Amino acid sequence: EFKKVAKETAITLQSYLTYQAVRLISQALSETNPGQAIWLGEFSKRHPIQESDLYLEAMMLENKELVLRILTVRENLAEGVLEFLPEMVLSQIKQSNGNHRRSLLERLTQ
Amino acid sequence: FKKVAKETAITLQSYLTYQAVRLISQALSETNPGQAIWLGEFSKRHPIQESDLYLEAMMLENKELVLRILTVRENLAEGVLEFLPEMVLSQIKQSNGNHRRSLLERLTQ
To answer: Name one GO molecular function term (chain B).
Structure first.
């Protein structure tokens, strides 16, 4: 029952999947149309993918076709990845937690 | 879809840690301002986006806080992870529609 945190994490996740889409598409383009990939690279320097909506809106001024392609790719990733995440993250934290704990307590002894 | 899932899972891990620290600091600033102010200074010196290093770093300075972060992040992790796929997937669809409509309008305008 921490909504503020759920909200901010969801929003973060949204932008991250957006970035994750741009990553895939960038690789694709680095093969197919290099000149366009160079553009995408430097575009992403001028605009933080962290504000994905501001990023996408900004892109509309330059390459509408890509925006659309991003919107699609991002949603597919979302479908493919989202459901596996809770189990995945929870046990990662658990394992990480254990290792830090056992490590920190060993330092006290040693 | 596997590589993405792992990278996302790591980020989310890293992120929830941050989010924990944040929540802890909010309380610390209400309670032990000296500690909170130190926490601030520390965060600047060590990048939270690197939790595992960020934590090991802090193990050399405030073991008691490290252990608290670990407990706190896991509480959030359990309270939040579950409602995440519905929220994000829905949130994307919604942003997706707006963006499409906006864009397709601009095209003819």
So the answer is: protein folding chaperone
